[PDB]
Amino acid sequence: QSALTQPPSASGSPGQSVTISCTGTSSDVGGYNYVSWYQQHPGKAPKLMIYEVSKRPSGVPDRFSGSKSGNTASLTVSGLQAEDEADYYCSSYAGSNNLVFGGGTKLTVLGQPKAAPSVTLFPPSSEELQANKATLVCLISDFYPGAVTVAWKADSSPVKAGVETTTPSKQSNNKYAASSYLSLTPEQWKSHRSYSCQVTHEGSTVEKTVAPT
Amino acid sequence: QVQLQESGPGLVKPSETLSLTCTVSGYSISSGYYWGWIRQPPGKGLEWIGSIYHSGSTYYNPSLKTRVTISVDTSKNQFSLKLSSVTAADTAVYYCARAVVGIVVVPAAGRRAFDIWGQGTMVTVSSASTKGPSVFPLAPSSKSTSGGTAALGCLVKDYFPEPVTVSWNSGALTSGVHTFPAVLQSSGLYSLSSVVTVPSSSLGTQTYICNVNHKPSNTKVDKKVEPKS
Amino acid sequence: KNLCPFGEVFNATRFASVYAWNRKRISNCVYDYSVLYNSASFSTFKCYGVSPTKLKDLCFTYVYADSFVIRGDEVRQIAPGQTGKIADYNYKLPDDFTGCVIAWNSNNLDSKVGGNYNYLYRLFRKSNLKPFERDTSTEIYQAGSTPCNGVEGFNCYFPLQSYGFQPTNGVGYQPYRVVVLTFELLDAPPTVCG
Ligand SMILES: *[C@@H]1O[C@H](CO)[C@@H](O)[C@H](O)[C@H]1NC(C)=O
């Protein structure tokens, strides 16, 4: 789709060498030696890793290298570290089209000590209840792989209404985390014996329970 | 010590003109370099918008030349972005950045590589109006204890549009903090939570305030989270 | 005739880069040159084919005002029979030069905090310049056998580079504004007089 082909994802292992390709045309990557590579970590600005095909800005580790061959440019990351897991974009001048960007490549480091999710379930605060609202907050942290299922219960009965769950994202420890919210009235919260947040990960389940009492 | 900072409204009604300004400090735009704008829609890639230098010359993205204007105010040391006839497709994080090359007359100048970036401001294109956040304490409870570590946090509820940033104790509490991605509720408003795992023995003696910031409105909320009594 | 407009050359707000030096012939006017060669606010005043005190009893057809900005180290090269990257690739004076070279320090005008990248010079040229020639081309210089095809790359350099004029630069590295007066006579009657 984007002006420059970039593989959607690349998977390297810790300490090994991973290479990301960027394929353009003769009017861009083949035409000129102005190919740039950026690193982007979740939530922060892009960072310049390689400019002018092979040059490296100061401070960028010499683990990162770039080269070009025909209509294809590539960035190579040797000695894969934990904080190399990020998004990577190639760039090039395309004459008439000026600066064009590749779609981007996701890089994940394969080391995977598996981790079960740590689940904390917060009852509605007394402040929110006095505002005549009630929200149950289920926070799911420190789990690898980043796939998890959330289910709510009133007493022992299932609840699927008023539930909003965020897609799992990774923390500052390279492990994943996610959140789920159950919106209630003040009356529903006090009507019931208890409410539960049931979190399923790798076939096994961790259930936390809060009670108005 | 070159630094770049974006400013402008976080909300723009559709078909109207987006306006952003980038203030530059530590280096006069008149001294050299090309200054550009790059945007990124949520969950998508980077799109270069255009570049400019102190004379006013500009190069634009061809898929945007009919709607983009880039200006420069050298006496006040800033350059601006106007983007007219906006749609939802223009909802993005907008960065201002400085080119690698200081010489202005190099080939492909302003369309090569970008060296210093701003933190980036987000613009949401929507007809709904801004709503400040309601902050509530996720008080540390007996249930939250996991040994010598307890969990507490803040619940930032019912705001629009993105984003809300959260810090703890003015930046004196950083390790063990996770501010979760916001969820979009049926109301069209967003909500998020920020949690921090702290020692259990210190709950009645250490002070914990989450610093919520919602720049779409001009709101800062400092909420003291106290042990549940 | 009234004053020669030498003021608008010496007192211009923007000076040109040496590679693209500016020129302005002066004609049909009179000027007192003591106001310059007794100024002492010019760090450099050197005349080659004429006494500066004889300009008042001398008339000429034309006077050329060439102005540019070079580095303090290179004011030496703005003279007849000089070599170096300025005299070879940017501004060349004839051996049979008749005029005056005037220079002064502009660190307080043309040096900027992170470097002033507007002031450029030519670092690569295949042939040395001829007297009073100006090359403003931006052609990718071939530094090897492999052609460049209009593309910058290995042994293919952009021929212009910048003085990174910073106010903390050493004095030999600081910017100096230059005005080169060239006095000319031919069969056209003399109109610019001292
Ligand atoms: C340059 O400007 C100053 C300020 O008015 C003036 O004193 C000086 O005579 C001017 N120089 C020339 C050559 O006219």
XYZ file of C-alpha atoms and ligand atoms in Angstrom:
650
model
C 0.000 0.000 0.000
C 2.464 2.646 1.193
C 5.014 4.039 -1.252
C 7.723 1.747 0.165
C 7.285 -1.951 0.925
C 8.330 -2.916 4.435
C 7.463 -6.368 5.873
C 4.704 -6.015 8.490
C 6.726 -7.944 11.096
C 10.242 -9.361 11.729
C 11.112 -11.815 14.553
C 14.714 -12.001 15.854
C 16.153 -13.805 18.919
C 18.255 -12.272 21.864
C 21.839 -11.640 20.787
C 21.206 -12.603 17.180
C 21.067 -10.562 13.992
C 17.783 -9.427 12.439
C 17.413 -7.565 9.130
C 14.433 -5.499 7.960
C 13.990 -4.891 4.235
C 12.564 -1.816 2.493
C 11.749 -2.168 -1.212
C 11.042 0.893 -3.335
C 11.554 1.752 -7.008
C 14.188 3.360 -9.261
C 12.514 6.740 -8.654
C 13.137 6.526 -4.857
C 15.476 3.998 -3.086
C 17.256 3.081 -6.362
C 17.366 6.716 -7.489
C 19.053 8.279 -4.483
C 21.245 7.635 -1.414
C 18.890 9.508 0.956
C 17.356 6.502 2.767
C 16.497 7.065 6.451
C 15.537 4.559 9.222
C 13.495 5.426 12.332
C 12.815 3.590 15.596
C 9.535 4.162 17.423
C 8.670 2.824 20.840
C 5.039 2.698 22.017
C 3.987 6.232 22.899
C 7.153 8.170 22.076
C 8.358 10.161 19.101
C 10.221 8.494 16.223
C 13.988 8.262 16.668
C 16.481 8.517 13.817
C 18.696 5.428 13.696
C 20.209 5.554 10.194
C 20.336 8.433 7.716
C 21.805 8.700 4.222
C 21.606 4.908 3.713
C 24.441 4.017 6.091
C 25.305 6.982 8.343
C 24.482 6.644 12.050
C 23.580 9.567 14.359
C 25.636 9.972 17.508
C 24.611 7.800 20.439
C 22.898 5.257 18.190
C 24.606 1.927 18.957
C 26.827 0.499 16.273
C 24.651 -2.630 16.583
C 22.356 -0.805 14.120
C 23.556 -0.703 10.519
C 21.944 0.175 7.216
C 22.744 -0.564 3.600
C 21.181 -0.407 0.148
C 21.128 -2.705 -2.876
C 19.227 -1.752 -6.024
C 15.627 -0.759 -5.286
C 15.898 -2.432 -1.854
C 17.258 -0.926 1.360
C 17.790 -2.793 4.611
C 18.473 -2.127 8.281
C 20.358 -4.767 10.295
C 20.184 -5.093 14.094
C 22.915 -7.356 15.527
C 23.123 -8.288 19.249
C 19.305 -8.032 19.630
C 18.638 -6.444 23.071
C 15.340 -6.371 25.041
C 14.616 -2.700 24.297
C 15.036 -3.226 20.537
C 11.431 -4.486 20.360
C 9.749 -1.551 18.621
C 8.390 -0.210 15.336
C 10.806 0.539 12.497
C 10.178 2.765 9.469
C 12.217 3.331 6.324
C 12.218 6.635 4.445
C 13.410 7.873 1.067
C 13.343 10.817 -1.302
C 11.189 10.101 -4.359
C 11.806 13.144 -6.546
C 8.389 14.509 -7.480
C 6.764 12.701 -4.546
C 9.379 14.224 -2.176
C 9.650 12.365 1.180
C 7.838 9.013 1.239
C 7.616 6.463 4.032
C 7.375 2.722 4.274
C 4.504 1.112 6.111
C 6.684 0.086 9.043
C 7.972 -3.182 10.521
C 7.221 -4.555 13.990
C 10.228 -6.172 15.664
C 9.735 -8.598 18.579
C 12.569 -10.241 20.540
C 11.709 -13.971 20.834
C 12.904 -14.615 24.402
C 9.658 -15.536 26.177
C 9.846 -16.475 29.866
C 6.098 -17.277 30.150
C 4.300 -15.288 32.850
C 0.838 -15.694 34.380
C -1.340 -12.580 34.722
C -1.424 -10.677 37.991
C -4.979 -9.429 38.531
C -6.105 -6.638 40.871
C -9.823 -5.803 41.010
C -10.874 -2.424 42.412
C -14.370 -1.805 43.819
C -16.062 1.527 43.036
C -14.610 4.334 45.120
C -16.876 6.015 47.651
C -16.285 9.255 45.718
C -17.716 7.817 42.509
C -20.675 6.322 44.396
C -21.491 9.713 45.899
C -21.509 11.020 42.315
C -24.179 8.321 41.691
C -21.889 6.225 39.473
C -20.163 2.869 39.943
C -17.226 1.438 37.983
C -15.398 -1.816 38.678
C -11.792 -1.703 37.460
C -9.968 -4.943 36.694
C -6.250 -4.485 36.036
C -4.373 -7.388 34.438
C -0.595 -7.170 34.462
C 2.684 -9.045 33.979
C 1.636 -11.793 31.556
C 3.381 -13.340 28.542
C 1.993 -14.257 25.908
C -0.097 -11.149 25.295
C -3.419 -12.923 24.815
C -6.030 -13.025 27.562
C -9.802 -13.300 28.054
C -11.890 -11.379 30.576
C -15.276 -12.381 31.952
C -17.381 -10.745 34.646
C -19.863 -12.165 37.126
C -22.589 -10.773 39.400
C -22.823 -13.218 42.289
C -22.175 -16.418 40.260
C -24.124 -15.218 37.195
C -22.306 -14.051 34.055
C -22.324 -10.332 33.075
C -21.526 -9.082 29.533
C -23.230 -5.658 29.575
C -21.357 -2.523 30.563
C -18.022 -4.264 29.929
C -15.162 -2.512 28.136
C -11.766 -4.208 27.819
C -8.606 -2.652 26.390
C -6.461 -4.577 23.928
C -3.361 -5.978 25.678
C -0.326 -3.693 25.556
C 3.197 -4.259 26.828
C 4.622 -2.691 29.985
C 8.082 -1.304 30.737
C 9.181 -4.861 31.611
C 8.424 -6.175 28.065
C 5.510 -8.136 29.581
C 1.899 -7.456 28.620
C -0.934 -5.789 30.527
C -4.604 -5.031 29.933
C -7.613 -3.524 31.706
C -11.345 -4.190 31.909
C -14.196 -2.019 33.195
C -17.700 -2.989 34.337
C -20.058 -0.019 34.660
C -22.816 -0.375 37.253
C -25.335 1.789 39.002
C -24.831 2.468 42.708
C -27.919 0.310 43.308
C -26.659 -2.671 41.281
C -23.365 -2.587 43.174
C -25.053 -2.776 46.573
C -27.807 -5.148 45.435
C -25.419 -8.027 44.805
C -23.489 -10.345 47.093
C -20.323 -9.851 45.057
C -18.785 -9.118 41.657
C -15.928 -11.065 40.056
C -13.352 -10.454 37.335
C -12.331 -13.758 35.726
C -9.086 -13.677 33.712
C -8.144 -16.646 31.495
C -4.601 -17.074 30.165
C -3.090 -20.303 28.775
C -6.229 -22.313 29.530
C -5.929 -21.463 33.247
C -7.958 -18.856 35.082
C -7.372 -16.324 37.857
C -10.528 -14.923 39.459
C -10.635 -11.910 41.807
C -13.773 -10.902 43.755
C -14.986 -7.646 45.412
C -18.052 -7.185 47.660
C -20.077 -4.080 48.672
C -19.858 -5.273 52.311
C 20.235 22.671 23.075
C 17.753 22.702 20.177
C 14.208 21.975 21.373
C 10.871 21.855 19.533
C 7.386 22.067 21.020
C 3.972 21.768 19.351
C 0.922 23.826 20.298
C -2.640 23.969 19.046
C -6.174 22.746 19.681
C -6.670 19.044 20.321
C -10.117 19.214 18.686
C -11.125 20.399 15.198
C -14.658 20.268 13.813
C -14.790 18.469 10.433
C -14.382 20.382 7.155
C -12.708 23.215 9.090
C -9.044 24.220 9.192
C -6.531 22.505 11.468
C -3.937 24.904 12.883
C -0.714 24.025 14.707
C 2.366 26.009 15.739
C 5.856 24.751 16.566
C 7.967 26.922 18.866
C 11.728 26.463 18.492
C 14.181 27.269 21.287
C 17.960 27.235 21.563
C 18.467 27.928 17.852
C 17.135 30.590 15.534
C 15.227 29.232 12.534
C 16.938 31.983 10.495
C 20.345 30.390 11.228
C 19.693 27.322 9.047
C 18.100 23.863 8.568
C 14.743 22.760 7.150
C 11.768 22.447 9.506
C 9.077 19.871 8.817
C 5.785 18.391 9.996
C 5.167 14.627 10.235
C 1.858 13.119 11.358
C 0.786 9.650 12.462
C -2.788 8.369 12.857
C -3.388 6.091 15.863
C -2.040 2.633 15.145
C -0.673 3.558 11.700
C 2.543 4.780 10.093
C 4.343 8.056 9.548
C 3.308 10.527 6.861
C 5.520 13.485 6.034
C 3.395 16.590 5.501
C 5.849 19.288 4.419
C 9.021 21.235 5.171
C 10.105 24.878 5.212
C 13.103 27.102 5.906
C 13.436 30.719 7.030
C 12.851 32.242 3.579
C 9.427 30.601 3.283
C 10.139 28.027 0.551
C 8.128 24.865 1.080
C 7.884 21.337 -0.214
C 4.677 19.423 0.446
C 3.399 15.880 0.283
C 1.707 15.514 -3.133
C -1.328 13.848 -1.569
C -1.870 17.003 0.512
C -0.764 20.063 -1.518
C -4.340 21.340 -2.087
C -5.011 21.560 1.684
C -1.607 22.228 3.318
C -0.030 25.577 4.098
C 3.202 25.813 6.090
C 4.333 29.213 7.382
C 7.296 30.536 9.346
C 7.538 33.470 11.789
C 11.244 34.140 12.203
C 10.901 37.194 14.465
C 8.894 35.021 16.863
C 10.887 31.851 15.937
C 8.077 29.457 15.082
C 6.623 27.698 12.054
C 2.995 26.726 11.600
C 0.821 24.175 9.827
C -2.597 24.916 8.348
C -4.637 22.015 6.966
C -8.072 22.912 5.611
C -11.195 20.829 4.929
C -10.312 18.238 7.556
C -11.941 14.824 7.936
C -11.616 11.926 10.352
C -8.683 10.709 8.242
C -6.749 13.756 9.506
C -6.954 12.574 13.140
C -3.315 12.002 14.064
C -0.408 12.794 16.345
C 1.329 15.707 14.618
C 5.073 16.109 15.094
C 7.272 19.043 14.226
C 10.892 18.153 13.514
C 14.213 19.552 12.310
C 16.120 18.218 9.316
C 19.540 16.620 9.758
C 21.279 18.930 7.245
C 21.847 22.556 8.219
C 22.704 23.679 4.686
C 19.532 24.782 2.924
C 20.551 24.264 -0.714
C 21.554 20.568 -0.591
C 19.745 18.216 -2.998
C 16.358 17.043 -1.682
C 16.749 19.529 1.181
C 13.955 19.110 3.731
C 13.003 15.726 2.240
C 15.756 13.486 3.590
C 16.142 12.776 7.314
C 14.850 14.403 10.487
C 17.027 14.793 13.551
C 15.270 16.500 16.480
C 11.572 15.889 17.119
C 8.929 17.480 19.265
C 6.909 15.409 21.694
C 3.999 15.645 19.241
C 0.491 16.986 19.768
C -2.629 14.992 18.929
C -5.517 16.463 16.940
C -8.899 14.752 16.880
C -11.314 15.721 14.110
C -14.850 15.388 15.458
C -18.035 17.373 15.949
C -18.346 16.439 19.630
C -17.121 18.979 22.176
C -14.357 18.690 24.750
C -15.096 17.232 28.180
C -12.715 17.380 31.118
C -11.902 14.207 33.034
C -13.357 13.011 36.305
C -10.565 11.573 38.474
C -11.336 9.035 41.210
C -8.953 7.249 43.604
C -8.334 3.507 43.275
C -7.652 3.294 46.985
C -5.190 0.666 48.225
C -7.253 -1.998 49.961
C -6.655 -5.162 51.923
C -7.696 -7.076 48.805
C -5.047 -5.284 46.718
C -2.129 -6.557 48.869
C 0.169 -9.109 47.160
C 2.678 -9.686 49.977
C 5.043 -6.780 50.572
C 3.630 -5.083 47.467
C 0.228 -3.367 47.248
C -1.614 -1.918 44.254
C -3.141 1.559 44.064
C -3.988 3.942 41.265
C -6.253 6.553 39.691
C -9.370 6.223 37.519
C -9.639 8.938 34.867
C -13.211 8.735 33.623
C -15.373 10.330 30.909
C -13.133 12.671 28.930
C -12.843 13.660 25.273
C -10.799 13.727 23.212
C -7.487 11.884 23.594
C -5.066 12.150 25.276
C -4.691 12.099 29.059
C -1.226 11.706 30.564
C -0.689 10.656 34.196
C 2.367 11.074 36.421
C 2.797 10.239 40.106
C 4.225 12.561 42.767
C 5.351 15.117 40.180
C 7.700 12.536 38.670
C 9.124 11.273 41.960
C 7.214 7.988 41.436
C 7.995 6.321 38.105
C 9.104 2.715 38.590
C 6.236 0.272 39.017
C 3.808 2.617 37.215
C 1.589 1.498 34.355
C -0.862 3.922 32.758
C -3.210 1.754 30.716
C -4.528 2.489 27.211
C -7.847 4.308 27.296
C -11.073 2.525 26.419
C -13.811 4.085 24.291
C -17.197 3.841 25.997
C -20.654 3.908 24.425
C -20.988 7.599 25.366
C -18.228 8.564 22.954
C -16.042 9.510 25.931
C -12.750 7.889 26.946
C -11.619 6.495 30.283
C -8.303 5.111 31.498
C -6.561 3.970 34.676
C -3.036 4.356 36.022
C -1.780 1.833 38.572
C 1.413 1.734 40.628
C 2.587 -1.125 42.835
C 4.057 0.208 46.083
C 5.244 -1.289 49.404
C 2.448 -2.469 51.687
C 4.059 -1.341 54.957
C 4.256 2.292 53.779
C 0.577 2.774 52.893
C -0.262 4.845 55.947
C 2.891 6.957 55.855
C 3.818 7.656 52.203
C 1.923 10.219 50.147
C 0.641 9.219 46.684
C -0.885 11.775 44.304
C -1.550 11.071 40.650
C -1.063 14.070 38.371
C -3.688 13.854 35.617
C -3.241 16.167 32.619
C -5.866 16.727 29.904
C -4.576 19.408 27.512
C -7.556 19.079 25.077
C -9.386 20.994 27.844
C -7.011 23.006 29.959
C -7.251 20.780 33.002
C -4.774 19.400 35.528
C -6.077 17.274 38.401
C -3.966 16.213 41.387
C -5.835 13.561 43.388
C -4.513 12.211 46.688
C -5.135 8.453 46.928
C -5.440 7.413 50.549
C -5.868 4.035 52.264
C -9.451 2.788 52.261
C -11.046 3.296 55.688
C 27.477 64.302 -9.847
C 26.785 63.367 -6.204
C 27.965 60.576 -3.888
C 28.897 57.168 -5.114
C 26.493 54.735 -3.368
C 29.331 52.903 -1.623
C 27.320 53.094 1.594
C 24.659 50.674 0.382
C 27.418 48.103 -0.259
C 29.427 48.516 2.948
C 26.288 48.922 5.055
C 24.107 46.179 3.564
C 22.316 43.990 6.093
C 22.780 40.731 4.168
C 26.098 39.788 2.599
C 26.502 37.058 0.014
C 28.304 33.737 0.398
C 31.778 33.762 -1.279
C 30.743 31.150 -3.912
C 27.970 33.516 -5.039
C 29.638 36.910 -4.563
C 27.707 40.097 -5.344
C 28.872 42.904 -7.623
C 27.797 46.460 -8.308
C 29.609 48.785 -10.690
C 29.655 52.423 -9.608
C 29.433 55.167 -12.214
C 28.920 58.921 -12.639
C 29.614 60.094 -9.098
C 32.300 61.382 -6.732
C 33.408 59.914 -3.414
C 35.921 60.826 -0.733
C 37.921 57.692 -0.060
C 39.600 59.001 3.119
C 36.307 58.253 4.827
C 37.207 54.581 4.284
C 41.008 54.306 4.286
C 41.105 56.326 7.527
C 38.228 54.457 9.169
C 40.216 51.970 11.314
C 36.939 50.097 11.739
C 38.137 48.071 8.745
C 40.432 45.318 10.033
C 41.915 45.054 6.509
C 42.550 47.800 3.931
C 45.040 46.879 1.197
C 45.375 48.587 -2.188
C 47.362 46.916 -4.949
C 47.683 49.046 -8.101
C 47.131 52.523 -6.596
C 47.885 54.878 -3.670
C 44.756 55.268 -1.503
C 45.695 58.955 -1.117
C 45.888 59.308 -4.918
C 42.257 58.270 -5.479
C 41.145 61.876 -4.912
C 43.188 63.165 -7.871
C 42.201 60.207 -10.074
C 39.128 59.520 -12.201
C 37.949 56.172 -13.569
C 35.262 54.865 -15.890
C 33.890 52.260 -13.480
C 34.355 51.057 -9.923
C 33.243 47.517 -9.057
C 32.029 46.687 -5.530
C 32.364 42.956 -4.898
C 31.085 41.894 -1.467
C 30.948 38.498 0.268
C 31.708 36.773 3.584
C 34.695 34.493 4.145
C 36.576 33.107 7.134
C 39.161 35.182 8.993
C 41.896 32.735 7.972
C 41.149 33.372 4.301
C 41.394 37.228 4.089
C 45.006 36.376 3.109
C 43.672 34.742 -0.090
C 41.781 37.812 -1.279
C 44.902 39.226 -2.912
C 46.657 38.963 -6.272
C 48.695 35.753 -6.709
C 47.146 33.707 -3.894
C 46.136 30.001 -3.646
C 43.795 28.105 -1.289
C 40.195 26.986 -1.459
C 38.832 30.554 -1.608
C 41.194 32.020 -4.227
C 40.993 28.850 -6.355
C 37.300 27.889 -6.139
C 35.380 30.978 -4.952
C 36.901 34.415 -5.662
C 40.053 35.086 -7.694
C 41.897 38.403 -8.130
C 44.039 39.044 -11.236
C 47.801 39.337 -10.860
C 47.529 42.759 -12.609
C 44.838 43.889 -10.134
C 44.275 47.597 -9.560
C 41.995 48.170 -6.596
C 41.581 47.836 -2.854
C 40.547 44.970 -0.575
C 38.544 45.967 2.521
C 37.549 43.535 5.272
C 36.140 43.654 8.782
C 35.028 41.197 11.466
C 31.293 40.402 11.459
C 31.233 37.797 14.248
C 28.663 39.987 15.997
C 26.395 39.967 12.903
C 26.937 36.673 11.065
C 27.794 34.178 13.825
C 24.779 32.324 15.248
C 24.370 30.117 18.304
C 24.175 26.666 16.785
C 26.096 27.773 13.714
C 25.046 29.917 10.753
C 24.606 27.533 7.818
C 23.579 30.213 5.323
C 27.185 31.146 4.500
C 28.677 28.659 2.043
C 31.870 28.145 0.046
C 32.872 25.838 -2.801
C 35.114 22.996 -1.616
C 35.322 21.053 -4.901
C 35.953 22.309 -8.436
C 37.663 20.552 -11.334
C 39.277 23.720 -12.726
C 40.558 26.689 -10.749
C 38.583 29.882 -11.320
C 39.688 32.659 -13.646
C 39.918 36.263 -12.385
C 36.500 37.693 -11.456
C 34.653 34.519 -12.483
C 31.645 33.327 -10.478
C 30.452 29.723 -10.298
C 27.045 29.337 -8.651
C 26.401 25.811 -9.982
C 25.321 22.985 -7.658
C 26.532 20.082 -9.793
C 27.529 16.895 -7.972
C 31.327 16.907 -8.152
C 32.938 13.681 -9.358
C 35.735 12.715 -6.941
C 36.502 9.433 -8.687
C 36.275 7.430 -11.877
C 32.685 6.252 -11.333
C 30.294 8.932 -12.692
C 27.695 10.557 -10.467
C 24.659 10.799 -12.788
C 23.452 13.837 -10.851
C 23.287 11.820 -7.599
C 25.280 12.439 -4.440
C 27.111 9.356 -3.190
C 30.494 7.650 -2.896
C 33.121 9.927 -4.476
C 30.131 12.055 -5.577
C 29.989 15.112 -3.312
C 27.830 18.195 -3.144
C 30.344 20.915 -4.124
C 29.246 23.457 -1.488
C 29.917 23.271 2.237
C 29.120 25.690 5.074
C 31.062 27.763 7.551
C 29.462 26.769 10.801
C 29.781 30.330 12.044
C 29.382 30.246 15.853
C 30.122 33.230 18.131
C 32.503 31.066 20.203
C 34.646 30.333 17.128
C 38.310 31.224 17.162
C 39.164 34.524 15.539
C 40.709 32.896 12.488
C 37.434 30.959 12.179
C 35.136 33.979 12.648
C 33.216 35.627 9.780
C 34.705 38.620 7.978
C 32.768 40.805 5.559
C 34.747 41.781 2.467
C 34.331 44.608 -0.043
C 36.625 44.497 -3.098
C 36.839 47.766 -5.022
C 38.125 47.374 -8.588
C 39.054 50.552 -10.489
C 38.848 50.245 -14.276
C 39.814 52.500 -17.156
C 39.159 52.071 -20.888
C 38.394 54.448 -23.790
C 35.024 55.239 -22.208
C 35.425 58.644 -20.519
C 36.014 58.540 -16.748
C 32.851 59.376 -14.783
C 33.599 58.151 -11.236
C 36.111 60.555 -9.711
C 37.794 61.005 -6.332
C 27.485 53.117 7.348
O 26.510 53.525 8.300
C 26.972 54.376 9.357
C 25.763 54.663 10.214
O 25.001 55.715 9.635
C 27.582 55.644 8.768
O 28.178 56.401 9.816
C 28.655 55.296 7.749
O 29.119 56.483 7.117
C 28.111 54.345 6.692
N 29.172 53.956 5.777
C 29.261 54.406 4.522
C 30.430 53.906 3.728
O 28.433 55.176 4.046
